[PDB]
Amino acid sequence: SRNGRDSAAQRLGVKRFGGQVVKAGEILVRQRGTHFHPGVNVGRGGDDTLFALAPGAVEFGAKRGRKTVNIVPVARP
Amino acid sequence: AELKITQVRSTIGARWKQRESLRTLGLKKIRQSVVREDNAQTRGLINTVHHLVEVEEV
RNA sequence: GUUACGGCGGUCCAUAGCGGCAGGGAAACGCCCGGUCCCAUCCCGAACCCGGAAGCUAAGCCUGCCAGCGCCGAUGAUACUACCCAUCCGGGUGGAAAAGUAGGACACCGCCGAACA
RNA sequence: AGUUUAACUGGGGCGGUUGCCUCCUAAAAUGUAACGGAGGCGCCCAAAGGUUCCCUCAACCUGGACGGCAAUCAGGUGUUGAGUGUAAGUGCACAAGGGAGCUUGACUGCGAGACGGACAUGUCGAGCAGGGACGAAAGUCGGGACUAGUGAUCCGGCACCUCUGAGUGGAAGGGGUGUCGCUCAACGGAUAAAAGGUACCCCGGGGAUAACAGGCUGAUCUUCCCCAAGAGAUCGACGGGAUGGUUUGGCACCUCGAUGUCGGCUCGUCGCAUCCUGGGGCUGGAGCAGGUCCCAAGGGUUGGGCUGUUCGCCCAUUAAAGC
RNA sequence: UCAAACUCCGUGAUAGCUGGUUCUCCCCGAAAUGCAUUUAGGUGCAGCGUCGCAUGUUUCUUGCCGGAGGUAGAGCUACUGGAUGGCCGAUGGGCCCCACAGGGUUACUGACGUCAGCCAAACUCCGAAUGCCGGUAAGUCCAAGAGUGCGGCAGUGAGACGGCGGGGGAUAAGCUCCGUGCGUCGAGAGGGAAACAGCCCAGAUCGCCGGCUAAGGCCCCUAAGCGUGUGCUAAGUGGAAAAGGAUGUGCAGUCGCGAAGACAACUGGUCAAGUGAUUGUGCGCCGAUAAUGUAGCGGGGCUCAAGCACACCGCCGAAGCCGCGGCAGCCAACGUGUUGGCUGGGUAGGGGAGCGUCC
RNA sequence: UUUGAAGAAUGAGCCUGCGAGUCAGGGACAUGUCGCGAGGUUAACCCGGGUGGGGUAGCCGCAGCGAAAGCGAGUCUGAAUA
């Protein structure tokens, strides 16, 4: 039979969920398209990877119909 | 309110959550009893293991 | 503070949209006049830009009213399901849809600025 | 003469496959097998890269010389159904889709923090410095919407270095930095270099593992039955529901520190789905004789030609020459 | 003795292979998975054990809170595909005219659509439950003998069956391959299922001629009920099976006809109360059917139930729990070894402490 | 030996003897214990009828970074205190 070929699993998906505190540079989601769009303090990578630009807590929101990921600057002690 | 919970069935063949709920309640053998206050956490615990224990209202 | 006013923003971005009917030009917003200057057309001053204000609210715009199209949308019940009983059939505790219906809806909020006090 | 001649395989052989990417299987985090189901890759682009600015399709309707469903032109409707170099998927109309101007960031030294992971690999990354591109500026630029377009180590080649230089000065050679050379495609790559036969075979293991027999199931076989389209009591198509392990099958639980493989002879035993004999029923039974269907397992059920045969065909019989 | 004799030597050749490996007790206690592999019955690393050290509840359970899904379900003029009740309707060909230009008629072929109804692992405008990530409050806490890191020593890397969700095969297998804070066996004795690794109850430290129970049972075998009350079954159903067939019977619901005389019997007469078809149901019947011997209740036997359904009351029943006594490991308290609380099945394997033999 | 064997998978007629993790090396790692301790220790060899005494050659600690030249509580990369 022709079949029998497949590629490796790419382990995509969301890495940090709502409420998790993160450091700057931490990867938030691993996605192919822009399923989630960058929000505040969130950048987009070459492979459309979302990461944190500032420390804080992950917050999932919708902006003009697009699901977005933002970082909330948790209060200093 | 005060609840008396007695273990009536064996842990053998039970799932991990049920054994751990029985331990969290604080009983180890058949026919052992504990007295625990009637709160939501206690209700969740007895709801996990209702098929292994008998509950009586003190 | 007020006006059928002009902008700049919002909201898990239509409950806001589209359509229909009826209105207006105070300052503004426009349409409008022209290509002399900056600038422009893969050709075209159509657009972009510049210089003006003779004309006009017919349009844009915004005001009021329409559920018409779209849109939003319960409760209940059911499907499904975690756990547990049950020799199958099925049952108990908990969670609980989509669809449909009742209904909502012809947007709401913030900051400036015009004209008026 | 010394050796090599891969693995997977529902036992083997032919065949196909071996690395990377996309979807389903996959049970709403990730991951998840099959010789399971679908496809693609071993590139390409000097612009299809960077930046700044601008634009919005496809489809339909109407009208236009050739011109037509369909070329180019105009008006309207048109929120994504077009297109994105290339599979598929996730995206993208705010455009990542279409156009133009300048340009080379398809940089150098780095890199907080992470993802993924047996390890080796792999992946993202703000920000800092140098020197630039585009832009009024803010700013963006460490190739391309993203995910494939690839090969470790060893060994050797080339360029540069303020490294080393076997007594000394050199040089040779070595070293560092950048980089080149592998369908090592069996793609974690046993050698730089390798095909076959054995029924002349030998050894050690394995029922992981098969061959004959069983244990299970039933594609197939057979014994029936269900409705009745019909032909005309008897046959019953088209469909449907059951037994059996008497057929070939499927599985490999059983044995490879041995379970003889077909027929025949000798000797059995059992079932009844009855060939004869026994008892009935209806006859499309006049009688004879049959058809056909029930009950019935006591006994009986031939000898030869051909073939190793079972099977089969034939020759004579017989109450009958059963399965 | 011959597809390369024999003897000695290299030599104690080499075998990822087969077999074997010898005293005791105490504590803990697996795996049959992932990746790579001239690899698949081997091995390396990881996963899971044990010992030591360090760290402390960071592990786990339950409640609440913050999150992302695209499964089940559902839906579809919300897309893409297959479709339909497939309707007209394209498109082509024949037929009729005969021109062959032009044409029309279908048993013609008959596009897409769509009033409406469908379907989908590779469809999704929707969309759970569980599970997963984080936060938080408690629980357990003289214990889980929990997590994490480092080091010493490992074994394992052929799993099996049962329950749920799927693929391959003919949804056939006591077939095969995956998922499952699923279970058990492996490595688990005891009780039950007649016997019965994988099913049900329950985890064995030792002793007792004590008690209470679980699953399963209580006519006799065989411990405990030929138990009580209300009903059903005639088939030994119970104590195996389908399509289908069938005036069995209990209950309930309907309707038709009927004292103007109902049904049967003998449209009109005699006669004399029910007489007809169903509807769902609880048990029953044929279907039912192979070859050693009853053989499809474990046996005897059972309907005078010892069968079934529903209520009720007892008892039997294990190494489970309790009672009394002995021992051991860990920890705690106070002490200068007592007491107390938990724990003590176990293969591979890890650690600790000992018996016996000889010099 | 196995997923699993009371056996229809393996081996054993019986008894008594015999029969399988040992040794070497200043080897390597870990962990006990003893001596000395910023030091510890000798090898060959020599002298003692011994198991005792001597023997400093070496070895391991005592500074690291860098390919190396080299610098040094720093060092390498780098134009850079970047």
CA of A54 to C1' of D304 (A): 109
- Domain boundaries defined on chain B: 1-58
* E-state strands within A1-77: 13-14, 21-22, 27-30, 37-38, 42-44, 50-52, 56-63, 66-72
Residue A10 phi/psi, 5-degree rounding, is -95, -5
Partner residues linked to A57 by β-bridges: A21, A72
Token pair 């970082």 is at which residue? A71
CA of B16 to C1' of F4 (A): 28
For A51, the 3-state DSSP assignment is strand
How far is the C-alpha of B58 from the C-alpha of B1, rounded, in Å?
7
Protein chain A, residues 36-75, with a C-beta closer than 7 Å to any atom of nucleic acid strand E: 58, 60, 67
Q: Which CATH architecture has domain B1-58?
A: 2-Layer Sandwich (3.30)
CA of A3 to C1' of D266 (A): 62
Residue A19 CB neighbour total at 10 angstroms: 10
